[PDB]
């Protein structure tokens, strides 16, 4: 009884790999007639993927294959410090076709014909390898539907109408974008839409190749982004989210216990939770401005404070040993019993706790889906990538977040018009986020999304049937 194998090729890096495995197990646990091969690409300096890959146990219907090139080849692929990433992924094209002939599930025997490619956004170069075997490719976007509508619009502005999108940079003119109810102010656009860099022209070349695929799985659900989703036509969109990994309870549990044990002592829906994603940090004078707003607000707070990278290079934000380096004098011993300052945080464990009632966030989409899965309203303080669009959508389109400052951009090169958001903006945003008990109407819809996000994944839900339709078309390639 033959099955169908899907060749998952996520963009390199843990996070993309973890999201690819999450959606892979959703397909395997839904339909017995499918196996999946995840192809891992590893960068040289990526501790974490190396740490995470070693923990991978190959399920009987799920094989994790590592296909990276020898270091001789990879080293010769740093030639362009802004075309590295597209060059690196393309560099694995010959080792992908080798996997198809040797290590894949094909040649039979549980064993079955190859059936499709599910590629990440940065892996559109793999569409051509899938066509050498006369087999359709797919896209799995861990971003949302509104960002796909934004990519289609700016791909059209750049390649079809040949518009120089630099004009919209920090502008006050409002754009009409398919999938956005109200005009989009230019100053809220992600930098990838206005920056004329090398990386963005190669990124929008990948958006042009979205049209060659059979389908696109987006990490959202129909009731969350209804206007953005119904503006997308080619190709067929499958909202299968919210896809999210709760299982990795690890930051291991001993420090989470103290954080959880402390939140257990706080009143319910009373603590506003500070966190800014994997690479989010702040400069000395901005952390200063946050401590004043937190004290001046009067609410309980769990603040995740990480230490910045050296700015030369040097990987991700770290952790402090003591926050005597960072914090204003007396703030620590004055927020005794009301506030706590940590480094890396068990985000899902914190957001699921009943004491947390507000989530100030950079609006990274995985973080947003985690907050909405537990009904926690958001304070929007975006930093990088598409987060400025996530913020504008959550604040102005979905009524699910209060603005801290939507036109904020964290500059890694050492680009923005605003350096410091003030404690007066932070406290006023926090004051509005936790206000009015549970008659806060932004909090009211956050409650609703928790029920709708849970309903979308169970049988009968929009994401459940949409995922069921994705599998049917995948097996329709094999018949
Ligand atoms: O202090 C932190 C910051 C982030 N995360 C986790 O890291 C991911 C961040 O998601 P996001 O979409 O924001 O990705 P990013 O924007 O960080 O690249 C989520 O799964 C969070 O649970 C965490 O556990 N602790
Ligand atoms: Cl967690």
Author numbering: 2 to 110, 112 to 252, 256 to 419, 421 to 485
From the study:
Here, we identify five lycibarbarspermidine glycosyltransferases, LbUGT1-5, which are the first phenolamide-type glycosyltransferases and catalyze regioselective glycosylation of dicaffeoylspermidines to form structurally diverse lycibarbarspermidines in wolfberry. LbUGT1 and LbUGT3 are the first phenolamide-type glycosyltransferases with crystal structures, and both exhibit a canonical GT-B fold consisting of two Rossmann-like fold (β/α/β) domains in the N and C-termini. The N-terminal domain (residues 1–242 and 467–485 in LbUGT1, residues 1–246 and 464–482 in LbUGT3) is mainly involved in the binding of sugar acceptor, while the C-terminal domain (residues 243–466 in LbGT1, residues 247–463 in LbGT3) is responsible for the binding of sugar donor.
LbUGT1 is the only UGT that can recognize both the dihydrocaffeoyl and caffeoyl moieties, selectively catalyzing a sugar transfer to the 3’-OH of the caffeoyl group and the 4”-OH of the dihydrocaffeoyl group. In order to elucidate the molecular mechanism, the acceptor substrate 1 was docked into LbUGT1 structure, the MD simulations revealed the two active binding modes, corresponding to 4”-O-glycosylation (mode 1) and 3’-O-glycosylation (mode 2), respectively, which were verified by the small d1 and d2 values during the 50 ns simulations (left). In addition, both binding modes showed several negatively charged residues, i.e., aspartic acids and glutamic acids (E83, D197, D416, E418), reside near the positively charged N5 of the substrate 1 (protonated in physiological environment). These residues may stabilize the conformation of the substrate through electrostatic or salt bridge interactions, and thus could play a crucial role in recognizing the spermidine unit of the substrate. Comparisons of the two binding modes revealed that the residue interactions are essentially identical except for Y389, which forms a hydrogen bond with the 3”-OH of the acceptor substrate in binding mode 1, but not in binding mode 2, suggesting that Y389 might play an important role in stabilizing binding mode 1 for the 4”-OH glycosylation of the dihydrocaffeoyl moiety. In contrast, the mutant Y389A remarkably changed its regioselectivity by eliminating its activity towards the 4”-OH but enhancing its activity at the 3’-OH. Additionally, the mutation of Y389 to F also showed increased 3’-O glycosylation activity and impaired 4”-O glycosylation activity, indicating the important role of the OH group of Y389 in the 4”-O glycosylation activity. Though both LbUGT1 and LbUGT3 first catalyze the 3’-OH glycosylation of the caffeoyl group, LbUGT3 can further catalyze the 4’-OH glycosylation on the same side of 2 to form an unusual ortho-diglucosylated product, while LbUGT1 needs to rotate the mono-glucosylated product for a sugar transfer to the 3”-OH on the opposite side.
